Design a protein around this ligand. Sequence first.
Ligand code: K
Ligand code: K
Ligand code: K
Ligand code: K
Ligand code: K
Ligand code: K
Ligand code: K
Ligand code: K
Ligand code: K
Ligand code: K
Ligand code: K
Ligand code: K
Ligand code: K
Ligand code: K
Ligand code: K
Ligand code: K
Ligand code: K
Ligand code: K
Ligand code: K
Ligand code: K
Ligand code: K
Ligand code: K
Ligand code: K
Ligand code: K
Ligand code: K
Ligand code: K
Ligand code: K
Ligand code: K
Ligand code: MG
Ligand code: MG
Ligand code: MG
Ligand code: MG
Ligand code: MG
Ligand code: MG
Ligand code: MG
Ligand code: MG
Ligand code: MG
Ligand code: MG
Ligand code: MG
Ligand code: MG
Ligand code: MG
Ligand code: MG
Ligand code: MG
Ligand code: MG
Ligand code: MG
Ligand code: MG
Ligand code: MG
Ligand code: MG
Ligand code: MG
Ligand code: MG
Ligand code: MG
Ligand code: MG
Ligand code: MG
Ligand code: MG
Ligand code: MG
Ligand code: MG
Ligand code: MG
Ligand code: MG
Ligand code: MG
Ligand code: MG
Ligand code: MG
Ligand code: MG
Lengths: 274, 85
Amino acid sequence: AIKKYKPTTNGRRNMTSSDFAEITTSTPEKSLLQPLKNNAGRNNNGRITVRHQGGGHKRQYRVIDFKRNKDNVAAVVKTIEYDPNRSANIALVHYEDGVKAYILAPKGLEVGMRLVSGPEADIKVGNALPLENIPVGTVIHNIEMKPGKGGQLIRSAGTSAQVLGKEGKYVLIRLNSGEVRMILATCRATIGSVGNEQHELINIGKAGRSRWMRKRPTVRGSVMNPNDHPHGGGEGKTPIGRKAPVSPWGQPAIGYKTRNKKAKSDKLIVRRRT
Amino acid sequence: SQERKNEIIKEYARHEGDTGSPEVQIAVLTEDINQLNEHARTHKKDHHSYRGLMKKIGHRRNLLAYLRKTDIQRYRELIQRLGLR
RNA sequence: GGAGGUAUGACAA
RNA sequence: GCCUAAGGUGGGAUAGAUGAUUGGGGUGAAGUCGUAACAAGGUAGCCGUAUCGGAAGGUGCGGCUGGAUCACCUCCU
RNA sequence: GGGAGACUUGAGUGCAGAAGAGGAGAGUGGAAUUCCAUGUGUAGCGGUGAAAUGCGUAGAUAUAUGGAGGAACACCAGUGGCGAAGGCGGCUCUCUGGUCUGUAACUGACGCUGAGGCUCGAAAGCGUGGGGAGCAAACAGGAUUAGAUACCCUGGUAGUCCACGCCGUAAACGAUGAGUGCUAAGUGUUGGAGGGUUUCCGCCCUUCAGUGCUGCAGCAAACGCAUUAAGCACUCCGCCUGGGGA
RNA sequence: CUCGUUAAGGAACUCGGCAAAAUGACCCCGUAACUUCGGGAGAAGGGGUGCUGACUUCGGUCAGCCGCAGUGAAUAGGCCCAAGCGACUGUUUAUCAAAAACACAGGUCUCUGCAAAAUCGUAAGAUGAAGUAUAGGGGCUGACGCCUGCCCGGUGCUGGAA
RNA sequence: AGUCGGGACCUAAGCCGAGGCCGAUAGGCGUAGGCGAUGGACAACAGGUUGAUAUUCCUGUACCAGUUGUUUUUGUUUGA
RNA sequence: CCCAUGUCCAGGUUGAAGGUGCGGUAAAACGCACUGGAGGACCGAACCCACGUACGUUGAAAAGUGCGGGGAUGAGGUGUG
Ligand SMILES: [K+]
Ligand SMILES: [K+]
Ligand SMILES: [K+]
Ligand SMILES: [K+]
Ligand SMILES: [K+]
Ligand SMILES: [K+]
Ligand SMILES: [K+]
Ligand SMILES: [K+]
Ligand SMILES: [K+]
Ligand SMILES: [K+]
Ligand SMILES: [K+]
Ligand SMILES: [K+]
Ligand SMILES: [K+]
Ligand SMILES: [K+]
Ligand SMILES: [K+]
Ligand SMILES: [K+]
Ligand SMILES: [K+]
Ligand SMILES: [K+]
Ligand SMILES: [K+]
Ligand SMILES: [K+]
Ligand SMILES: [K+]
Ligand SMILES: [K+]
Ligand SMILES: [K+]
Ligand SMILES: [K+]
Ligand SMILES: [K+]
Ligand SMILES: [K+]
Ligand SMILES: [K+]
Ligand SMILES: [K+]
Ligand SMILES: [Mg+2]
Ligand SMILES: [Mg+2]
Ligand SMILES: [Mg+2]
Ligand SMILES: [Mg+2]
Ligand SMILES: [Mg+2]
Ligand SMILES: [Mg+2]
Ligand SMILES: [Mg+2]
Ligand SMILES: [Mg+2]
Ligand SMILES: [Mg+2]
Ligand SMILES: [Mg+2]
Ligand SMILES: [Mg+2]
Ligand SMILES: [Mg+2]
Ligand SMILES: [Mg+2]
Ligand SMILES: [Mg+2]
Ligand SMILES: [Mg+2]
Ligand SMILES: [Mg+2]
Ligand SMILES: [Mg+2]
Ligand SMILES: [Mg+2]
Ligand SMILES: [Mg+2]
Ligand SMILES: [Mg+2]
Ligand SMILES: [Mg+2]
Ligand SMILES: [Mg+2]
Ligand SMILES: [Mg+2]
Ligand SMILES: [Mg+2]
Ligand SMILES: [Mg+2]
Ligand SMILES: [Mg+2]
Ligand SMILES: [Mg+2]
Ligand SMILES: [Mg+2]
Ligand SMILES: [Mg+2]
Ligand SMILES: [Mg+2]
Ligand SMILES: [Mg+2]
Ligand SMILES: [Mg+2]
Ligand SMILES: [Mg+2]
Ligand SMILES: [Mg+2]
């Protein structure tokens, strides 16, 4: 659940966090840890390409098994662990053959569940099946767009998609955004919804906490200089003073769509949203 | 459950064949109360059932008060056996 | 026969 | 030397008077605006609540008959 | 009144039965509305006291096949049932409260009321997150009008729905606190029980608990109430003391 | 220039109590409005402090002694009432501006179905992200509380397609 | 200076980069593979001595890696 | 500004969540103690900073010094690469 801190200090005032009740341990799997460096929004040229990123706490990457292509044997859920890299929690699972892996933790997952993957797996939270085998109306997550590539869609905490129907070699899906689109029927998905639904409700509370989470301050364009931002300049506070608000590089910032107009995936997107 | 009820009645019977008596009634009420407390925690919004639970609690309280007034030693024995206050 | 449901107009005289 | 009245200092508590200004309320034989209610009062009224409107008030939801007229059902005579 | 006993009628338990939209949770079915898609098809549709706004040749309305999604559960349905009250109506399952009737095995007055407290509490409203078909405050436009910040018409947001949490008020009404006993009848109806018949169905008699109607005694200012009292009595509680100001 | 003292007065100085003065440690008593119930608060306002005996439950207490004065020197908050602005801790013009400016947690709008959008780059290749709509980018507002009215004609954006 | 710090050890960020990708030229990018400590690994201390060095020289007492040789055990292809 | 890897923050103060005990109740909520040790928490050296003022202004100094001043477990300081 969400615990609210008493307003002992102005910084702590109105702050909330998770109790981490679901988390069963704090010792990740050594075999599955990998090193990660904080790119801080800088590409191979060393230029800042994405603003407002950098600093914050050190992290280790946990190798998640998005593919769920090990259908031979059952995987027993050993622990539910905190993952610094993603909003959702992960689950360490042991395959009966001794292979250890991490998966996303679906809502309602519990230690001891014996998950299975493959066409014949039953429709139970945490199981993985090709979309063709998942009955309509089912709630799923960790959907892959191409067979064997591994789950890409519906992975954030609390997210979920629903199977609407079949057609041809494609399966009709409503994604978490409300967009309805076709996805290749041989793509896999995990039954259920991503756990840690409460994540959205956390109140960060103070600037230092965002800095921990690797967000650097965001400076409004209206308080820059004209050579810095189209909104920059002007005496005193100023209105936008343009036809429409724009990003630092002149791209309109309200309502202007950016999806490529000749996207190949229009043929598969049935109903858009966002 | 009648079977559970009957076993409790035999356990707390003041004497052979004693269906009705402060001890038997209080013990049976206590088990119903515990079972119904679990139902209430499962169904927080079952207000109508909760009213019956309160009535059972009141009746059990009245029986305890009568028993204490009548034979304090039997009252002490019963509260110890049932783990009551 | 009965019963429950389906625009304005003082004041007193 | 202790005790201690009075006096001094201090922060509170409490009672009243007073105060630019302001709020609702009341009275005032013939002022202005409408006509909300009483008849089915001309959209039945009323209660709680919400919102809107110069004003009475309107509308929404729920509730009551302390509901006129009329057509059915069930009950009684 | 106290103390020591006894008792079973009140109260409760046991045992055997009865009914129910009682509550909570998870599912699920059909009609209808709206929207979406596609055929047919052409000039209206819709609406009023009468009109207009509006929708429609960018092909509407209608019509046929589908799809989506939301809310409410037609017929049954009945002064019918259930709940302390608010209230509860598709169906299924899970959990669960109460009530009623027998019986007389059990306890042996263990009961009634109940300030303060606690809990529950229509609708509207509020917070967080969802959902959003229809309806619809606010609001827009068309009307009506002297004016119309309304009634009428076309649209329409919050809300109505869900989860959790607040709120705590209603003509929350039978405008009638609870408990108990007693005081003519007649007649419906719900759930039982016993008997006398009846081949069974069913008819009759008795009886309990509801639920209506009519109506003596009695009560009342009158209207009226009248075994479901507002009659005759006892116990406890809440409440009233001219109107306004309030 | 740096420092010490200063009769009586005590802010009359001055743009302005600038500077200086004053407060300053520990222990005890005591402590308001307001409040988001955490604070406000070291509020305020007071009292004690040395040495020597006696007794102590070891912290005291009782008795006595000395001085103008006992944290005897040094090092240690001045306080209160009220208004504006900004919630707050932070950040800023290295070298005339530290602020009411920026940031901020929170709010909201909008883009983005993943070879995502965005950005660096001719490209390859990168960041975004070994992340996936409870995520990421952009615009505005800026804790919290109560709220956020009317206008879609014009300009943008979005949709439409005769 | 075998023992301290560095090299003959290891890797992070970053950098270079066979082939390779991309590109008017120049070149840009990058795989394998490398480089790169501020980190990991790693055997010696006490005293004395000079005008100037000392865990480096000297005295004492060690340790680490290895070579030769003597001796002692054990294995020689069902093989340590 | 950022990356990787080290390192620094005397000493005091306050007392969040949680936990235990005892009350309290049908069970609770709740109350009181104790425990516990949170914080862009408090006071204050080193450290970092640079608010006021005097002096300096061919300076001791091409930005400082004296007296005061703010932060001082963090959105912190700082070293190496
Ligand atoms: K805060
Ligand atoms: K996480
Ligand atoms: K900003
Ligand atoms: K400006
Ligand atoms: K009216
Ligand atoms: K039942
Ligand atoms: K709501
Ligand atoms: K009612
Ligand atoms: K009857
Ligand atoms: K009066
Ligand atoms: K003077
Ligand atoms: K103060
Ligand atoms: K003295
Ligand atoms: K001080
Ligand atoms: K500021
Ligand atoms: K701020
Ligand atoms: K403000
Ligand atoms: K400052
Ligand atoms: K600034
Ligand atoms: K605000
Ligand atoms: K934003
Ligand atoms: K703006
Ligand atoms: K923001
Ligand atoms: K406009
Ligand atoms: K426009
Ligand atoms: K060496
Ligand atoms: K080193
Ligand atoms: K200075
Ligand atoms: Mg950003
Ligand atoms: Mg500027
Ligand atoms: Mg420009
Ligand atoms: Mg401008
Ligand atoms: Mg201006
Ligand atoms: Mg009228
Ligand atoms: Mg009227
Ligand atoms: Mg009327
Ligand atoms: Mg209106
Ligand atoms: Mg409601
Ligand atoms: Mg309307
Ligand atoms: Mg009332
Ligand atoms: Mg009757
Ligand atoms: Mg003087
Ligand atoms: Mg003097
Ligand atoms: Mg002066
Ligand atoms: Mg002067
Ligand atoms: Mg000064
Ligand atoms: Mg001193
Ligand atoms: Mg500030
Ligand atoms: Mg500051
Ligand atoms: Mg400067
Ligand atoms: Mg300055
Ligand atoms: Mg601003
Ligand atoms: Mg070395
Ligand atoms: Mg290269
Ligand atoms: Mg080459
Ligand atoms: Mg070594
Ligand atoms: Mg030397
Ligand atoms: Mg601090
Ligand atoms: Mg330094
Ligand atoms: Mg600086
Ligand atoms: Mg401070
Ligand atoms: Mg400090």
